[PDB]
Amino acid sequence: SSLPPNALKPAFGPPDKVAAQKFKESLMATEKHAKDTSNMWVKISVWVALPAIALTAVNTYFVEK
């Protein structure tokens, strides 16, 4: 239905910028660092937090009695 002649011409240019491909490959570096720093923080939790909660629980049970 009578397209203007600027219809099927391209619109965005050269799609191989090194910036966005290194962005896509840094999308693996964030996942690797997350898989390190979640293991680190769950070790922090099960070593540091739970004995403190247990000691504070026996203290608060004694004084709650």
């Binding site: 570096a29 964030t30 660092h33 720093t37």
Partner: protein, 99 residues
């Protein structure tokens, strides 16, 4: 014997140590150039508040380390103020009578 002067300011040292603790945790965690700003800020805040509430009980042990050296306070400073309040009345009305 230094416990008097730098346990009178407990809640100045605790608050300044909290601010310095968040600063010295933030400058450590921000050197890792991979994370979001928000995750760095919340991890620094967690480390800071942990060391701060850990120091809050050290000041309790220090507080009874002061309390053996000055027994039953808040009630015998009041009577020192009362002695200075009775001397200021007697010194004044004796010169009111003979002046």
């Amino acid at each position: 014997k230094f416990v008097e002067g730098l346990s009178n300011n407990k809640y100045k040292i605790i608050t300044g140590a909290w601010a310095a603790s968040l600063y010295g945790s933030w400058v450590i965690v921000n050197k890792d150039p991979i994370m979001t700003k928000a995750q760095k800020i919340v991890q620094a805040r967690m480390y800071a508040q942990f060391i701060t509430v850990g120091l809050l009980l050290a000041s309790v042990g220090l507080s009874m380390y002061e309390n053996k050296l000055h027994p039953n306070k808040q009630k015998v400073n009041e009577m020192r103020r009362w002695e200075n309040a009775l001397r200021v009345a007697e010194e004044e009305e004796r010169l009111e009578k003979e002046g």
